[PDB]
Design a protein around this ligand. Structure first.
Ligand code: 1VU
Ligand code: ATP
Ligand code: MG
Lengths: 673, 247, 261
């Protein structure tokens, strides 16, 4: 971070989110002015406020704002910025952008056009890697055009077959084939999908590696001809062929294999004359045999992890190399220091296919920056919203330690101390992954999530002791709220006679079971008896802080109280998982035994208004039996006619809606069976 | 719950263009202690929100407009629902906090035949006779007599604040231009000048109608401070057996 | 030699003439009287004492500072008088000046009369004929309404407040009569609505006239807003005097007792 060295005085960051913030932070540490592009919706983002000046480039969609070459070039000309940093994604691997930037005097901080073009298609990448004497996945070199050629190639390469789309990206257009019929129908549908998605329609057939390990080598090159490999990374934990958890050194690897893979990656980089930061990805089998798989000619998303074990700043090195300076490190200087782990906190529901993108506005956002060995890379601030236009990633959380165990412990603590209110996230899944027995042992593959959760993610299956601890914490919190409710100021007209209750006898319903709890308070210490077991819970009992730290029998636990109702319902985030409990007094439970179970007649057999809108006309009458796919009535809503399908069978008892009528959400319109 | 807690989540909650709506319940939850709100009549006359909460441990009554429902316009049901709640809070020494995003009253023959004048007068009266401390925050539009009704400074209001998105005017720009520059028939620049000069809190700020224009992230803190100084508010009014509210 | 005397005389003659002779004739063609004629009919002969006769508005936007836009009195005639020997305070809105729209000076005059009436303990009678808030005034006009509104709520139960709508009334001008004790209307020439028919057609998309939306029949037979409707201005004012004879001057006074045969 020497300011004496002369670099560009103006850099434009042609990206958004956390990567823009990271680049701007590096530039500020390097004393470089920054220009930030943004859309209209991102006018109040973190990166625009962090930068020195901002330029609007278009509307919300990425096709018109961040992929709009003309707007970016107008911004560059207006701001007279000397350098441009594309981050990752968007225009980072676009040859037209690089060429048009090279037309002017503005420099592109990244690989040259030749390197990007070479590693732009997978077939040519594989051919070049084979020419460069790098182990490659066995398969057929060429574009498969008919299903017969595909099934033949499957015959001479073995029935396990990986069908892939050229260029591709985002973990899409890739499928598995075990049979000739599977080969041909997968080939046809993959051609159709590639036409729908990319249009390249060039498909590749290769051998599928069984139980593979995704190991990346981080390479760094300069225009003079020096190439370095900055250790490795492991990114096996994936869903939808996308990483969620990354590890700094691969526990699966030893020194010799690491050196071999680093040398091979350096050889490939020299072959393509790479002159920036990049990564070479490999699929290592159980027998420590690695094969080349793709080369990312851009900054890697999980790059900070290696920054924790090498002590380097990759963005600064990219800037210096783009300026023209030689590398200031040698291969001997690169060394492994400690251990590091990264988790991607996404705004998605982990209970639906290991993640389903969600939308909303963050009403509360607090990061565990004060915890030891914690680094956060986020472009999210309180009040930020998650839209349908951009990636739903919330943050990248990185922890480092002396060994793997310390890093994992700090990772778990950071996940426990992370406040996100407003959207659904995947913190529960990450915490379950990092404390898994197999993950701690180290035996993992790219199918870890698929086989650890064959039926889908279900949450933390809490043991007996953990269940008792959770029940004790919930009961103590309930009693603490009850006690706080009795603290009034002095009235001097009618004094308050505080009740002298000694033991609180409660019935606590968790899942489908009811437990009897006896709680006693002795100041800041609660003695809780759960079904015989005795526990002591102590804390400051601050009922307003989002994070509450308690000590149960000496074990420290951080919990969050997401929701609470006067009826006894509480949502408690404990060990990363949200549990719904219901707490009543014993008398309340005994009297509640007489309450009738409410039956919901609105659920089915009723056209309860799914959403507010105006109905043009009604296509049904009393006495008509609906069928699946038969719309009941066409209703214009969100400026769209929503003729919702029945999706069930039932004779219409009565009709309450008329043609061209405005009806809000929750209003009955058609009664059926 | 510290009384000086900042609420940065409110800095961008109001959309830039007035066509979009937002939820004032989010603002209420952010502002009040522990985000705990006891709503009264939550499923009836949903264009207005009334309820009980606490700030710095003191019970407060909250009244606000709901731009999600009917663009936040006032009508008969909302007027009565807010009026009786305000009367109860005033009768039992409970401070009142108002959030204003009202564009006006709901038009139509149904409202006029139902007696919208009487019920609007009910709400205006309820805010006017209140002698408890009153704190008002204008988040967006405040047009016409509705602005006077929703606890204006001129009804013996105590403290009035405007967010940088507030708009206090007689009505929207188009109507004012079409009624002022009737014969000009050159509204092309007239509307631009009118929106540049009056479509902002400045006309009310320069006259002293709002005490300050505050950042949305400081709202709670400001309110708490006011509630500390207004706790000893005594006022004197002419004697009567009782008044005659337009029931 | 000073021109102050002729200045006073010219200002007085302009104040009596109101907005102008042409607009007075236009008002008379609609079957409506002027504010000063209404006051002369309502009060006992020779008992009217006017106040704030030379008060003028202070608007400076949209060329309202020009001499042709300056009218002494500013679309309201305010004062005190006697009905059958009993004191009363009265204001009459002059539709001749800017359609009777309420400005800062208009509201200031009305507030001054209301303040004096509550100081001495006498009723307030308001003849309403106003187009609403003066748009050129801006927030000023709004403030004025609120001031009046506040005083109404302060005077409720202290002194009787009577309203007589003798012309169209829109916007906030409908809210002050609603806060008073009794509201009277004149048939075929008085209206009361928050929004006009054009806005109703624009938003709700229904076709109604002014009479159907806010006529005296509408507010006396189905709305519950007005209390009685009279044939015309003269009949309305005679009935207003007769009705005023019933009420006490203040809540500090007992109910009136008259000579009984
Ligand atoms: C606080 C709540 C608010 O913001 S109230 C906003 C005002 N609302 C309105 O609807 C506009 C006011 N005018 C009207 O409603 C109608 O014109 C009513 C009152 C029914 C008058 O009917 P009409 O007999 O046809 O009037 P007119 O054609 O003879 O015109 C007479 C002159 O009066 C004027 N006038 C009336 N109101 C205002 C006003 N609020 N501000 C400024 N000027 C007003 C008109 O401009 C009109 O001018 P002109 O002499 O025809 O050139
Ligand atoms: N031949 C193969 N054998 C086994 N697993 C494979 C094979 N090809 C791909 N995979 C799996 O699919 C994942 C995605 O592969 P790859 O990186 O080629 O895809 P992509 O769409 O180009 O991704 P990216 O977002 O990195 O550009 C790999 O990490 C691996 O888990
Ligand atoms: Mg890849």
């Amino acid at each position: 971070y020497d300011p004496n060295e002369k670099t560009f005085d103006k850099i434009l960051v042609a990206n958004r989110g956390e990567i823009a913030c990271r680049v701007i932070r590096t530039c500020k540490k390097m004393g470089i002015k920054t220009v930030a592009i943004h859309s209209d919706v991102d006018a109040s983002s973190v990166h625009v406020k962090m930068a020195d000046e901002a330029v609007c480039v278009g509307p919300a969609p990425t096709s018109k704002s961040y992929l709009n070459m003309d707007a970016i070039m107008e911004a560059i000309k207006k701001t007279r910025a000397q350098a441009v940093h594309p981050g990752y994604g968007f225009l980072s691997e676009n040859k037209e952008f690089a060429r048009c930037l090279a037309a002017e005097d503005v420099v592109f901080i990244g690989p040259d056009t030749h390197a990007i073009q070479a590693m732009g298609d997978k077939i040519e990448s594989k051919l070049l890697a084979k020419k460069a004497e790098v182990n490659t996945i066995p398969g057929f070199d060429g574009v498969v055009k008919d299903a017969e050629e595909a099934v033949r190639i499957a015959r001479e390469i073995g029935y396990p077959v990986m069908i892939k789309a050229s260029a591709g990206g985002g973990g899409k257009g890739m499928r598995i084939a075990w049979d000739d019929e599977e080969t041909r129908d997968g080939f046809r549908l993959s051609s159709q999908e590639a036409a729908s998605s990319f249009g390249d329609d060039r498909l590749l057939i290769e051998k599928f590696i069984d139980n593979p390990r995704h190991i990346e080598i981080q390479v760094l090159g300069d225009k003079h001809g020096n190439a370095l490999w900055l250790n490795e990374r492991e990114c096996s934990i994936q869903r939808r062929n996308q990483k969620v958890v990354e590890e700094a050194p691969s526990i699966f690897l030893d020194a010799e294999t690491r050196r071999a893979m680093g040398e091979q990656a350096v050889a490939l980089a020299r072959a393509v004359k790479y002159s920036s930061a990049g990564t070479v990805e490999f699929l290592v089998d159980s027998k420590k045999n690695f094969y080349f798989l793709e080369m990312n000619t851009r900054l890697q998303v999980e790059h900070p992890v290696t920054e924790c074990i090498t002590g380097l700043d990759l963005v600064q090195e990219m800037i210096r190399v783009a300026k023209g300076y030689p590398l200031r490190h040698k291969q001997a200087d690169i060394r492994i220091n400690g251990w590091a782990v990264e988790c991607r906190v996404y705004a998605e529901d982990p209970y639906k296919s290991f993640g389903l993108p969600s939308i909303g506005r963050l009403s509360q956002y607090q990061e565990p920056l004060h915890l030891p060995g914690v680094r956060v890379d986020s472009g999210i601030q309180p009040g930020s919203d998650i839209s349908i236009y951009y990636d739903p990633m919330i943050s990248k959380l990185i922890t480092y330690g002396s060994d793997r165990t310390e890093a994992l412990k700090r990772m778990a603590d950071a996940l426990d101390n992370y406040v996100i209110r407003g959207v659904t996230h995947n913190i529960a899944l990450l915490r379950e992954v990092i404390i898994n027995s197999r993950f701690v042992k180290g035996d993992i593959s790219t199918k870890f999530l698929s086989d650890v959760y064959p039926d889908g993610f279900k949450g933390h299956m809490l043991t007996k002791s953990e269940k008792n601890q959770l029940l004790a914490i919930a009961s103590s919190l309930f009693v603490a709220f009850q006690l706080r409710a009795q603290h009034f100021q002095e009235n001097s007209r009618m004094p308050v006679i505080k009740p002298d209750i000694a033991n609180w006898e409660l019935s606590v319903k968790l899942h489908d079971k009811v437990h009897t709890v006896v709680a006693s308070n002795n100041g800041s210490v609660f003695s809780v008896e759960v079904d015989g077991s005795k526990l002591n819970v102590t804390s400051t009992w601050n009922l307003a802080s989002p994070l509450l730290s308690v000590s149960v029998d000496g074990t420290q636990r951080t919990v969050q109280c997401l929701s609470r109702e006067a009826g006894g319902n509480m949502s408690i985030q404990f060990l990363g998982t949200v549990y719904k409990v219901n707490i009543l007094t014993r008398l309340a439970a005994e009297l509640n035994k007489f309450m009738l179970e409410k039956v919901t007649e609105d659920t089915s057999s009723v056209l309860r208004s799914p959403m507010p809108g105006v109905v043009v006309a009604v296509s049904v009458k009393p006495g008509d039996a609906v069928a699946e796919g038969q719309e009941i009535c066409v209703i214009e809503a969100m400026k769209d006619q929503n003729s919702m399908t029945a999706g069930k069978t039932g004779t219409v008892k009565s009709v309450h809606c008329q043609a061209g009528d405005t009806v809000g959400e929750g209003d009955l319109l058609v009664e059926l069976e | 719950d510290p009384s000086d807690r900042l609420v940065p989540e409110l800095d961008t909650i109001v959309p830039l263009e007035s066509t979009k709506a937002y939820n004032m319940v989010d603002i209420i939850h952010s502002v009040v202690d522990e985000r705990e709100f006891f709503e009264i009549m939550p499923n009836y006359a949903k264009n207005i929100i009334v309820g009980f909460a606490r700030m710095n441990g003191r019970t407060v009554g909250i009244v606000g407009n709901q731009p999600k429902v009917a663009s936040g316009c006032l009508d008969i049901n909302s007027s009565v629902k807010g009026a009786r709640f305000v009367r109860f809070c005033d009768a039992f020494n409970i401070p009142l906090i108002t959030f204003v995003d009202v564009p006006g009253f709901l038009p139509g023959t149904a409202q006029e035949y139902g007696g919208i004048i009487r019920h609007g007068a009910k709400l205006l009266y309820a805010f006017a006779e209140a002698t408890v401390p009153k704190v008002t925050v204008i988040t967006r539009k405040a047009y016409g007599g509705a602005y006077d009704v929703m606890s204006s400074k001129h009804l013996c209001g105590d403290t009035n604040y405007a967010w940088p998105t507030a708009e206090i005017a007689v009505m929207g720009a188009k109507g004012a231009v079409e009624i002022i520059f009737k014969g000009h028939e050159n509204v092309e620049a007239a509307q631009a000048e009118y929106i540049e000069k009056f479509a902002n809190p400045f006309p009310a700020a320069v006259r002293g109608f709002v005490d300050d224009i505050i950042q949305p992230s400081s709202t709670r803190a400001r309110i708490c401070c006011d509630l500390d100084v207004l706790a000893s508010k005594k006022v004197q009014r002419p004697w009567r057996k009782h008044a005659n509210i337009p029931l | 030699a000073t021109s102050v005397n002729e200045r006073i005389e010219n200002k007085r003659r302009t104040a009596l003439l109101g907005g102008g002779q042409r607009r007075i004739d236009a008002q008379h063609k609609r079957g409506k009287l002027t504010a000063r004629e209404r006051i002369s009919l309502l009060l006992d002969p020779g008992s009217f004492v006017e106040s704030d006769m030379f008060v003028e508005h202070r608007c400076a936007d949209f060329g309202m500072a020009a001499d042709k836009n300056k009218f002494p009195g500013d679309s309201v005639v305010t004062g005190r008088g006697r009905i059958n020997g009993r004191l009363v305070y009265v204001f009459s809105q002059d539709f001749t000046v800017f359609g009777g729209s309420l400005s800062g000076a208009h509201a200031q005059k009305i507030c001054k009369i209301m303040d004096q009436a509550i100081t001495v303990g006498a009723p307030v009678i308001g003849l309403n004929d106003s187009g609403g808030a003066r748009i050129q005034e801006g927030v000023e006009s709004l403030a004025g309404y609120a001031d009046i509104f506040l005083r109404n709520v302060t005077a409720s139960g202290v002194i009787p407040q009577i309203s007589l709508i003798m012309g169209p009334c829109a916007g906030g001008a409908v809210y002050s009569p609603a806060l008073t004790d009794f509201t009277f209307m004149v048939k075929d020439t008085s209206y009361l609505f928050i929004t006009g028919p054009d806005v109703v057609k624009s938003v709700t998309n229904e076709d109604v006239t002014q009479e159907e939306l806010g006529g005296a029949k509408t507010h006396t037979t189905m709305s519950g807003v007005a209390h009685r409707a009279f044939e015309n201005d003269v009949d309305a004012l005679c009935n207003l005097r007769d009705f005023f004879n019933y009420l006490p001057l203040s809540s500090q006074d007992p109910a009136p007792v008259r000579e009984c045969h």
